[PDB]
Amino acid sequence: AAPANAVTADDPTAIALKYNQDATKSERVAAARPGLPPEEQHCANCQFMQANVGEGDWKGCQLFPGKLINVNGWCASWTLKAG
Ligand code: SF4
Ligand SMILES: [N+]
Ligand SMILES: [N+]
Ligand SMILES: [N+]
């Protein structure tokens, strides 16, 4: 059961970025974003995930203010967590 503030499927930004809560049901391969092979990409290893926001598997994403994403999710703004 997703948190009340989870990013949802008719969120316009989620649609535009092709977010999914489950990276295995994402188009990460098609996008081929740089920094890791696409099968290795998900929110937990993304620069925009906010480790100090949320709880458990439901964490912040800077691009989705006021929302939570799933650490196992993905979107097309995936960028390696570098610092
Ligand atoms: S920007 Fe990164 S942390 Fe935010 S939803 Fe996309 S992949 Fe997940
Ligand atoms: N939500
Ligand atoms: N597609
Ligand atoms: N956030």
Swiss-Prot record:
Residues binding [4Fe-4S] cluster: C43, C46, C61, C75
Keywords assigned by UniProt, alphabetized: 4Fe-4S, Electron transport, Iron, Iron-sulfur, Metal-binding, Transport
GO molecular function: 4 iron, 4 sulfur cluster binding; electron transfer activity; metal ion binding
Activity under varying temperature: Thermostable.
A Pfam family annotated for this UniProt entry: HIPIP
GO biological process per UniProt: aerobic electron transport chain
UniProt keyword annotation of Signal present: no
Assembly information from the UniProt record: Homodimer.
Summary of the function given for this chain in its UniProt record: Specific class of high-redox-potential 4Fe-4S ferredoxins. Functions in anaerobic electron transport in most purple and in some other photosynthetic bacteria and in at least one genus (Paracoccus) of halophilic, denitrifying bacteria.
Family to which the UniProt record says this protein belongs: Belongs to the high-potential iron-sulfur protein (HiPIP) family.
Protein name: High-potential iron-sulfur protein
Native source organism of the sequence: Thermochromatium tepidum (Chromatium tepidum)
Organism lineage: Bacteria, Pseudomonadati, Pseudomonadota, Gammaproteobacteria, Chromatiales
